[PDB]
Amino acid sequence: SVITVGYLRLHQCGLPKKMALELFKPFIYGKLELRGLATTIKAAKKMVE
Amino acid sequence: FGIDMNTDYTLEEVGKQFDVTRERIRQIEAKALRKLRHPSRSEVLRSFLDD
Amino acid sequence: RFPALLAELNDLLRGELSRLGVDPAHSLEIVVAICKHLGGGQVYIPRGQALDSLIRDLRIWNDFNGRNVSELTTRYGVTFNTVYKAIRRMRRLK
Amino acid sequence: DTILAHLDNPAEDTSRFPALLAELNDLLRGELSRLGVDPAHSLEIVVAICKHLGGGQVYIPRGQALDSLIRDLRIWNDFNGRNVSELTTRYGVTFNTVYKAIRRMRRLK
Amino acid sequence: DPILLRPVDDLELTVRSANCLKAEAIHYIGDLVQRTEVELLKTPNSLTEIKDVLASRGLSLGMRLENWPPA
């Protein structure tokens, strides 16, 4: 991505939401499976889509 | 269907094992299939229709 | 055999839909549903004695209020032991 | 019915192909929910299916036979004796198809 | 009391007793507990099977309950 300035704490970085779901997508699939809102993995894929 | 096995078996291949019945095994398969079409167990299966 | 049988099934289904208040022309997809999970051969669908006996006993004990055992036996053609079984069964449900 | 609520599980108690056709009422009650009426009426239809269609066995096809049957039934349901051209105009089919449907209605007993 | 509103089905009584009370159409445990022993003996065929089962459940006939039935 491109860099930009921030009020943030020293140990915090601003990550945009659009890339957040893309990066942690497998984690989202697993958490959605454990939370029970998605019957199957591809259903979770549709939901994140 | 040969699932969990190296190969599948036809009607005559499974007849010599249990019983040589021809239409009876076919209707057993049909009954099992229609049992699997019940909307009590097939809710998860229907999601796999798109693939 | 199959075309006439299917026609009879469809017309009877749509007539019952009209009786139930639904639109008769919605019968066709129902038989299509009958196809999609039941097509392939011929099956025997004679009575289904479970629900018939259950509704029979339900009507029997609906007629029963306190003392009509003799009339129940005369009408439904079942002895007093069946009446006792039905009353116990309706006591099971709360 | 009414007590059918309590009967929900006993409906399939020590059951048979009723339970299979219980699946039917599921679909039926689903369409009933689609229809707008209360789904719990579905059992009535199915028990009617037991009384006026039960007692025998039927073979069921898989292909174009039922397509021809549904086309011809939708053709002949609006026939009144003097509306052959009306059927041809409405259903977008030639006089041959509507006349064949009329012959189908005539030849049955 | 969580037993007065319960129906007579929670007694597990004998068939003769389960049949006799239906003649008077008793539907609540409170309804039968209001009735005393001096008038429930007139029905045919019970006199040796009610006190024990009622005592096992901590109840006794003849007690006076107001606002009955509360609906």
Coordinates of C-alpha atoms in Angstrom, one line a residue:
Chain A
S1 CA 0.0 0.0 0.0
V2 CA 0.9 3.7 0.2
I3 CA 2.0 5.2 3.5
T4 CA 0.3 8.1 5.3
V5 CA 0.6 9.9 8.6
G6 CA -1.7 9.7 11.6
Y7 CA -2.9 10.5 17.1
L8 CA -2.2 6.8 17.1
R9 CA -0.4 5.1 20.0
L10 CA 3.2 4.0 19.5
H11 CA 2.3 0.4 19.1
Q12 CA -0.7 0.9 16.8
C13 CA -0.7 0.9 13.0
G14 CA -3.7 1.9 10.8
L15 CA -4.7 -1.0 8.7
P16 CA -7.5 -0.3 6.2
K17 CA -10.6 -2.5 6.4
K18 CA -10.6 -3.6 2.7
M19 CA -7.2 -5.5 3.0
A20 CA -8.1 -6.7 6.6
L21 CA -10.7 -9.2 5.4
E22 CA -8.5 -10.2 2.5
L23 CA -5.5 -11.0 4.6
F24 CA -7.2 -12.8 7.5
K25 CA -9.8 -14.4 5.2
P26 CA -8.9 -18.0 6.4
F27 CA -9.2 -16.8 10.0
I28 CA -12.6 -15.4 9.1
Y29 CA -13.6 -18.7 7.6
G30 CA -12.5 -20.6 10.8
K31 CA -14.2 -18.1 13.2
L32 CA -17.4 -18.2 11.2
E33 CA -17.4 -22.0 11.2
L34 CA -16.8 -22.1 15.0
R35 CA -19.4 -19.4 15.6
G36 CA -22.0 -21.5 13.7
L37 CA -23.4 -18.8 11.3
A38 CA -22.0 -20.7 8.3
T39 CA -22.9 -24.4 7.7
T40 CA -20.1 -25.0 5.2
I41 CA -16.8 -23.4 4.2
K42 CA -18.0 -22.3 0.8
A43 CA -21.0 -20.7 2.5
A44 CA -18.5 -18.7 4.5
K45 CA -16.8 -17.8 1.2
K46 CA -20.1 -16.5 -0.2
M47 CA -20.7 -14.6 3.0
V48 CA -17.3 -12.9 3.0
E49 CA -18.0 -12.1 -0.7
Chain B
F1 CA -19.9 -46.2 -5.6
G2 CA -16.5 -47.5 -4.4
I3 CA -16.1 -44.7 -1.8
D4 CA -13.3 -45.6 0.7
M5 CA -12.4 -48.5 -1.6
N6 CA -9.9 -48.8 -4.5
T7 CA -12.7 -49.6 -7.0
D8 CA -16.5 -49.6 -7.4
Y9 CA -18.7 -52.6 -8.0
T10 CA -21.6 -53.0 -10.4
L11 CA -25.0 -54.6 -9.7
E12 CA -23.7 -58.1 -10.6
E13 CA -20.5 -57.5 -8.6
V14 CA -22.4 -56.7 -5.5
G15 CA -25.0 -59.4 -6.1
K16 CA -22.6 -62.3 -5.7
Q17 CA -21.6 -60.8 -2.3
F18 CA -25.0 -60.5 -0.5
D19 CA -27.8 -61.6 -2.9
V20 CA -28.1 -61.9 -6.7
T21 CA -31.4 -59.9 -6.7
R22 CA -31.5 -57.4 -9.6
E23 CA -34.4 -55.1 -9.1
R24 CA -34.3 -55.4 -5.3
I25 CA -30.8 -54.0 -5.0
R26 CA -31.8 -51.2 -7.5
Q27 CA -34.8 -50.3 -5.3
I28 CA -32.6 -50.5 -2.2
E29 CA -30.3 -47.9 -3.8
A30 CA -33.4 -45.8 -4.8
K31 CA -34.8 -46.0 -1.3
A32 CA -31.5 -44.9 0.2
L33 CA -31.3 -42.1 -2.3
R34 CA -34.8 -40.8 -1.6
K35 CA -34.1 -41.1 2.1
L36 CA -31.0 -38.9 1.5
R37 CA -33.3 -36.4 -0.3
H38 CA -35.3 -35.7 2.9
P39 CA -35.0 -32.1 4.0
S40 CA -33.9 -33.2 7.4
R41 CA -30.4 -34.3 6.4
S42 CA -30.0 -32.7 3.0
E43 CA -29.9 -29.0 4.1
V44 CA -26.1 -29.1 4.2
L45 CA -26.0 -31.2 1.0
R46 CA -28.0 -28.7 -1.0
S47 CA -25.3 -26.1 -0.5
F48 CA -23.0 -28.4 -2.5
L49 CA -25.4 -28.1 -5.5
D50 CA -23.7 -25.0 -6.9
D51 CA -20.4 -26.9 -7.3
Chain C
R1 CA -50.2 -46.7 -17.3
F2 CA -48.0 -43.8 -16.2
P3 CA -49.6 -40.9 -18.2
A4 CA -53.2 -41.6 -17.0
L5 CA -52.0 -42.2 -13.4
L6 CA -50.1 -38.9 -13.4
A7 CA -53.1 -37.1 -14.8
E8 CA -55.3 -38.5 -12.1
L9 CA -52.8 -37.6 -9.4
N10 CA -52.5 -34.0 -10.7
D11 CA -56.3 -33.4 -11.1
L12 CA -57.0 -34.9 -7.6
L13 CA -54.2 -32.8 -6.1
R14 CA -55.5 -29.6 -7.7
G15 CA -59.0 -30.4 -6.6
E16 CA -57.8 -30.9 -3.0
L17 CA -55.9 -27.6 -3.3
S18 CA -59.1 -25.9 -4.3
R19 CA -60.8 -27.6 -1.3
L20 CA -58.0 -26.4 1.0
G21 CA -58.4 -22.9 -0.4
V22 CA -55.1 -22.9 -2.4
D23 CA -55.0 -22.3 -6.1
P24 CA -55.4 -25.6 -8.0
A25 CA -52.9 -24.6 -10.8
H26 CA -50.1 -25.0 -8.2
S27 CA -50.4 -28.8 -8.2
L28 CA -48.1 -29.3 -11.2
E29 CA -44.8 -28.4 -9.5
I30 CA -45.9 -30.5 -6.5
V31 CA -45.9 -33.5 -8.8
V32 CA -42.6 -32.2 -10.2
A33 CA -41.4 -32.3 -6.6
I34 CA -42.9 -35.8 -6.5
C35 CA -40.6 -36.5 -9.5
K36 CA -37.4 -34.9 -8.3
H37 CA -37.0 -37.0 -5.1
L38 CA -39.0 -40.1 -6.1
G39 CA -38.5 -40.7 -9.8
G40 CA -36.9 -43.8 -11.1
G41 CA -39.2 -46.7 -10.6
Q42 CA -42.4 -48.1 -9.1
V43 CA -43.2 -48.0 -5.3
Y44 CA -46.1 -49.3 -3.2
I45 CA -47.9 -46.6 -1.3
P46 CA -50.9 -48.6 0.0
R47 CA -52.2 -47.3 3.4
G48 CA -49.7 -45.9 5.9
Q49 CA -51.5 -47.5 8.8
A50 CA -49.7 -45.4 11.5
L51 CA -51.4 -42.1 10.9
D52 CA -54.7 -43.7 10.0
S53 CA -54.8 -45.6 13.4
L54 CA -53.6 -42.4 15.2
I55 CA -56.4 -40.2 13.7
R56 CA -58.9 -43.0 14.4
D57 CA -57.9 -43.2 18.1
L58 CA -57.9 -39.4 18.2
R59 CA -61.5 -39.2 17.0
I60 CA -62.3 -42.1 19.4
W61 CA -61.1 -40.2 22.5
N62 CA -62.5 -36.9 21.2
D63 CA -65.9 -38.6 21.3
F64 CA -65.1 -39.8 24.8
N65 CA -66.0 -37.4 27.6
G66 CA -66.7 -39.5 30.7
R67 CA -68.8 -42.6 30.2
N68 CA -69.4 -43.4 26.5
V69 CA -67.3 -46.6 26.4
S70 CA -70.3 -48.7 25.3
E71 CA -71.1 -46.2 22.4
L72 CA -67.4 -46.2 21.4
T73 CA -67.4 -49.9 21.2
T74 CA -70.6 -50.0 19.2
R75 CA -69.5 -47.3 16.8
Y76 CA -65.7 -47.8 16.3
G77 CA -65.8 -51.6 16.7
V78 CA -63.0 -51.7 19.3
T79 CA -63.2 -53.1 22.8
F80 CA -62.8 -51.3 26.1
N81 CA -59.1 -52.2 26.4
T82 CA -58.3 -50.2 23.2
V83 CA -60.3 -47.3 24.8
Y84 CA -58.1 -47.6 28.0
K85 CA -55.0 -47.6 25.8
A86 CA -56.2 -44.5 24.0
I87 CA -57.1 -42.7 27.3
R88 CA -53.6 -43.6 28.7
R89 CA -52.0 -42.3 25.5
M90 CA -53.9 -39.0 25.8
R91 CA -52.9 -38.8 29.4
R92 CA -49.2 -39.2 28.3
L93 CA -49.4 -35.9 26.4
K94 CA -49.6 -32.8 28.6
Chain D
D1 CA -55.9 -32.2 13.8
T2 CA -55.0 -29.4 16.3
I3 CA -53.1 -31.9 18.5
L4 CA -50.9 -32.3 15.5
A5 CA -48.4 -30.1 17.3
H6 CA -47.9 -32.9 19.9
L7 CA -48.2 -35.3 17.0
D8 CA -45.1 -33.7 15.4
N9 CA -42.7 -36.4 16.4
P10 CA -45.3 -39.2 16.9
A11 CA -46.3 -38.5 13.2
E12 CA -43.2 -40.5 12.2
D13 CA -43.3 -42.9 15.2
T14 CA -42.8 -46.5 14.1
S15 CA -43.4 -45.1 10.6
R16 CA -42.8 -46.1 7.0
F17 CA -43.0 -44.4 3.6
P18 CA -45.4 -42.1 5.5
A19 CA -42.2 -40.6 6.8
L20 CA -41.0 -40.4 3.2
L21 CA -44.2 -38.6 2.3
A22 CA -43.7 -36.7 5.5
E23 CA -40.8 -35.2 3.6
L24 CA -43.5 -34.5 0.9
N25 CA -45.5 -32.5 3.4
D26 CA -42.3 -30.6 4.3
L27 CA -42.0 -29.6 0.7
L28 CA -45.8 -29.1 0.7
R29 CA -45.8 -27.0 3.8
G30 CA -42.8 -25.1 2.4
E31 CA -44.9 -24.3 -0.7
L32 CA -47.7 -23.7 1.8
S33 CA -45.5 -21.1 3.4
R34 CA -44.8 -19.9 -0.1
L35 CA -48.6 -20.0 -0.8
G36 CA -49.4 -17.9 2.3
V37 CA -51.6 -20.4 4.1
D38 CA -50.5 -21.9 7.4
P39 CA -48.0 -24.8 6.7
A40 CA -49.6 -27.0 9.4
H41 CA -52.5 -27.7 7.0
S42 CA -50.2 -29.9 4.8
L43 CA -50.9 -33.1 6.6
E44 CA -54.6 -32.9 5.5
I45 CA -53.6 -33.0 1.8
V46 CA -51.2 -35.9 2.5
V47 CA -53.8 -37.9 4.4
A48 CA -56.1 -37.3 1.5
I49 CA -53.4 -38.6 -0.8
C50 CA -53.5 -41.7 1.4
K51 CA -57.3 -42.1 1.1
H52 CA -58.0 -41.3 -2.6
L53 CA -54.7 -42.3 -4.2
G54 CA -53.3 -44.8 -1.7
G55 CA -53.9 -48.6 -1.9
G56 CA -51.9 -49.3 -5.0
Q57 CA -48.6 -48.7 -6.7
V58 CA -47.6 -46.3 -9.5
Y59 CA -44.6 -46.1 -11.8
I60 CA -43.2 -42.6 -12.3
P61 CA -41.3 -41.4 -15.4
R62 CA -38.3 -39.0 -15.6
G63 CA -38.4 -37.1 -18.8
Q64 CA -40.4 -35.4 -21.6
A65 CA -43.6 -37.4 -20.9
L66 CA -44.4 -35.2 -17.9
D67 CA -43.5 -32.1 -19.9
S68 CA -46.0 -33.0 -22.6
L69 CA -48.5 -33.9 -19.8
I70 CA -48.2 -30.5 -18.1
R71 CA -48.4 -28.6 -21.4
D72 CA -51.5 -30.5 -22.4
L73 CA -53.1 -30.0 -19.0
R74 CA -52.5 -26.3 -19.0
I75 CA -54.0 -26.3 -22.5
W76 CA -57.1 -28.3 -21.6
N77 CA -57.9 -26.7 -18.2
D78 CA -59.3 -23.6 -19.9
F79 CA -61.3 -25.5 -22.6
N80 CA -65.1 -24.7 -22.5
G81 CA -66.2 -26.3 -25.9
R82 CA -65.9 -23.1 -28.1
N83 CA -62.5 -21.7 -27.2
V84 CA -60.0 -23.7 -29.2
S85 CA -58.7 -20.5 -30.9
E86 CA -58.5 -18.9 -27.4
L87 CA -56.3 -21.8 -26.2
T88 CA -54.1 -21.4 -29.3
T89 CA -53.7 -17.7 -28.8
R90 CA -53.1 -17.9 -25.1
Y91 CA -50.6 -20.8 -25.0
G92 CA -48.8 -20.0 -28.3
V93 CA -49.4 -23.5 -29.7
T94 CA -50.9 -24.6 -33.0
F95 CA -54.4 -26.1 -33.4
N96 CA -52.8 -29.6 -33.5
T97 CA -51.6 -29.5 -29.9
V98 CA -54.8 -28.2 -28.5
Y99 CA -56.8 -30.7 -30.5
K100 CA -54.5 -33.5 -29.3
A101 CA -55.1 -32.3 -25.7
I102 CA -58.9 -32.4 -26.3
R103 CA -58.5 -36.0 -27.7
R104 CA -56.5 -36.8 -24.6
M105 CA -59.5 -35.6 -22.5
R106 CA -62.0 -37.5 -24.6
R107 CA -60.2 -40.9 -24.7
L108 CA -59.9 -41.2 -20.9
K109 CA -62.5 -43.0 -18.8
Chain E
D1 CA -48.3 -24.0 45.4
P2 CA -47.1 -25.5 42.1
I3 CA -49.3 -28.6 42.3
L4 CA -52.8 -27.0 42.5
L5 CA -52.7 -25.8 38.9
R6 CA -51.3 -29.2 37.7
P7 CA -53.9 -31.5 36.3
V8 CA -54.9 -34.9 37.8
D9 CA -52.5 -36.6 35.4
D10 CA -49.6 -36.2 37.8
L11 CA -51.0 -38.8 40.3
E12 CA -49.9 -42.1 38.6
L13 CA -53.1 -43.6 40.1
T14 CA -54.6 -47.0 39.5
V15 CA -56.9 -47.7 36.6
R16 CA -60.0 -48.0 38.8
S17 CA -59.1 -44.7 40.4
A18 CA -58.2 -43.2 37.1
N19 CA -61.6 -44.2 35.8
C20 CA -63.8 -43.3 38.8
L21 CA -62.8 -39.6 39.0
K22 CA -63.6 -39.2 35.3
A23 CA -67.3 -39.7 36.2
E24 CA -67.2 -36.5 38.2
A25 CA -64.9 -34.9 35.6
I26 CA -62.0 -33.8 37.9
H27 CA -59.4 -31.9 35.9
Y28 CA -57.3 -30.2 38.6
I29 CA -55.5 -31.6 41.7
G30 CA -56.9 -28.6 43.6
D31 CA -60.4 -29.6 42.4
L32 CA -60.1 -33.0 44.0
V33 CA -58.2 -31.7 47.1
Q34 CA -61.2 -29.3 47.8
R35 CA -63.5 -32.3 47.8
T36 CA -63.5 -34.1 51.2
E37 CA -63.6 -37.8 51.9
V38 CA -67.2 -37.7 53.2
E39 CA -68.6 -37.3 49.7
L40 CA -66.1 -39.0 47.4
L41 CA -66.9 -42.4 48.8
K42 CA -70.4 -42.5 47.2
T43 CA -69.0 -43.3 43.8
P44 CA -68.7 -47.1 43.2
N45 CA -65.3 -48.7 43.6
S46 CA -60.1 -46.1 45.9
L47 CA -60.7 -45.7 49.6
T48 CA -57.3 -47.4 50.4
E49 CA -55.3 -45.8 47.6
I50 CA -55.7 -42.0 47.8
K51 CA -54.3 -41.1 51.2
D52 CA -50.9 -42.7 50.7
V53 CA -50.3 -41.3 47.2
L54 CA -51.4 -37.8 48.4
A55 CA -49.2 -38.0 51.5
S56 CA -46.2 -39.0 49.4
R57 CA -46.8 -35.7 47.4
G58 CA -47.4 -33.7 50.6
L59 CA -51.1 -33.1 50.1
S60 CA -54.3 -34.0 52.0
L61 CA -58.0 -33.8 51.1
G62 CA -60.3 -31.4 53.0
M63 CA -58.0 -28.4 52.9
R64 CA -59.7 -25.0 52.2
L65 CA -58.4 -23.0 49.3
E66 CA -59.8 -19.6 48.3
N67 CA -59.9 -17.9 44.8
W68 CA -60.2 -21.4 43.3
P69 CA -59.9 -21.8 40.4
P70 CA -57.7 -18.8 39.7
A71 CA -57.8 -19.5 35.9

